[PDB]
Design a protein around this ligand. Structure first.
Ligand SMILES: *C1=C(N2CCN(C)CC2)C(=O)c2ccccc2C1=O
Ligand SMILES: *C1=C(N2CCN(C)CC2)C(=O)c2ccccc2C1=O
Lengths: 152, 162
């Protein structure tokens, strides 16, 4: 990833330069690059509510009663404990809308600031403008399964 | 009308049987919709009570459905297309997670929609169908209330009750 100071400043400001929401055949919503990114560049935060697993379960019980909701819980482990970034609410933050690929052009990185973990996407290779932004949801999937033993 | 309630039902049942057998889904298209992604749009008129489309997929029982959910959770490209429902003494599920062509799975939720789910029996096999709850004009998004579907999923998933 690029310089830590710069990443911290982007995370704090929430500036989401260089991408747009689009509608994509066979998928629905996705995110399209509107600028070039170099390998290692910060692309965007997977931004939502950072919560612990107890609160995530309760939230999943609410979301299950609300048919408009999509699946936006991103589970992960930080310093032994399980956390979740809950991006279920419709906002203007774009990371939550980035779709899955095994050969995507972004990768998840856990980037902590003063003891608070953030899930961010970094460019895994150079990205041309016009490409759909995509990352491997494998780790996300695994963590979901780990957090719901009834699935497993 | 000279047609009794029972005559209407028999007539409508024949119409629906033939559309299930054929699988024809005329009068609609897959679309991309701002703020939603995929959905289905009416491209002809439908009158209140008309068959619109089947919610087509693999009919399975609850134990099987929960086994499939564990597999779908491993493949991140899967959407949420399990439709649970009660039929007589049992819960079933129409699994449309691996349907391609058949559009019923793609119809979106609303509380103010223009379709209604009905259970249609063909020789003891339950089929989930969508019928028009009012007249629908070409250009309109097809929409039904997922309430019953949502309540049945919760009943099948005790983990999601709390
Ligand atoms: C996606 C889910 N959702 C949220 C609720 N809405 C109605 C459908 C989409 C889940 O409910 C859920 C629960 C447990 C594990 C995984 C998921 C999803 O992937
Ligand atoms: C939607 C789900 N899916 C299938 C798996 N993919 C990866 C995400 C979307 C669920 O997994 C699920 C499980 C239990 C209850 C409800 C749901 C969904 O709504």
């Amino acid at each position: 990833s690029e310089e830590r100071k710069r990443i911290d400043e982007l995370i704090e400001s929430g500036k989401e330069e260089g991408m747009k929401i689009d509608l994509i055949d066979g998928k629905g919503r996705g995110v399209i690059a509107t600028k070039q990114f170099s390998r290692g560049d910060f692309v965007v935060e997977y931004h939502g509510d950072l919560i612990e697993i107890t609160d995530a379960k309760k939230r999943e019980a609410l979301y299950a009663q609300d048919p408009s909701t999509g699946c936006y819980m991103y589970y992960f482990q930080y310093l032994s404990k399980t956390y979740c970034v809950d991006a279920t609410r419709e906002t203007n933050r774009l990371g939550r809308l980035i779709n899955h690929s095994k050969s995507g052009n972004c990768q998840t990185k856990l980037h902590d600031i003063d003891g608070v973990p953030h899930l961010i996407l970094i460019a895994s290779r150079d990205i041309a403008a016009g490409e759909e932004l995509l990352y491997d949801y494998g780790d996300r999937s695994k963590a979901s399964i780990e957090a719901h033993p009834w699935l497993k």
